[PDB]
From Swiss-Prot:
It is found in: Nucleus speckle; Cytoplasm. One of its GO terms (cellular component) is nucleoplasm. This is Peptidyl-prolyl cis-trans isomerase H. One of its GO terms (biological process) is mRNA splicing, via spliceosome. Residues 10-172 form the PPIase cyclophilin-type domain. Signal peptide: none annotated. The gene is PPIH. It comes from Homo sapiens (Human). Transmembrane segments: none annotated.
Length: 173
């Protein structure tokens, strides 16, 4: 009841060059602080690597699979192969205390144990087969409808949206 509130960040989403609303995301600093902090810093747009700002502003959701998940966060290569973190390079899986038990959760994408970077996915549905494999670190607390809007975008090969689904702007609440 008197516990400090988790940090909250926002994503202003654009689909096909048209703004479609804001998603407010709570980051679980009280469960996975290191993972939450990595994400928070990339939302500010003020975090710098070698003097150059890196973050989610302008990044794409390169893969949208309705009834499953939406992946994005690759501000490095913009195609799902990019890796970066505030710790420089891939970082360890903090813990798997939280499960992919509902739609709207934020979880870290990876390419195996302890390969977390900047990429993440938002669950469109529960997906327990990812439990213990991906670190859950946040969830949409306002504007879940925007996630549903993204979910319905027409996709092409490998479920890449046919229209740009971008993080037009982001930052902290």
């Amino acid at each position: 009841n008197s516990s400090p509130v988790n940090p909250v960040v926002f994503f202003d989403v654009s689909i096909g060059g048209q703004e479609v609303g804001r998603m407010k995301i709570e980051l679980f600093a009280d469960v996975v602080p290191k993972t939450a902090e990595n994400f928070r810093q990339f939302c500010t747009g003020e975090f710098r690597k070698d003097g150059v700002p890196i973050g989610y502003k302008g990044s794409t959701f390169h893969r949208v699979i309705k009834d499953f998940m939406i992946q994005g966060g690759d501000f490095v290569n913009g195609d799902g192969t990019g890796v970066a973190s505030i710790y420089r390079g891939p970082f360890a899986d903090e813990n798997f205390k939280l499960r992919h038990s509902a739609p709207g959760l934020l979880s870290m994408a990876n390419s195996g144990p302890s390969t977390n970077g900047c990429q993440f996915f938002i669950t469109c549905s529960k997906c327990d087969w990812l439990d213990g494999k991906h670190v859950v670190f946040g969830k949409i607390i306002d504007g879940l409808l925007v996630m549903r809007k993204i979910e319905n975008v027409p996709t092409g090969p490998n479920n890449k949206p046919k229209l740009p689904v971008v993080i037009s702007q982001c930052g902290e609440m």
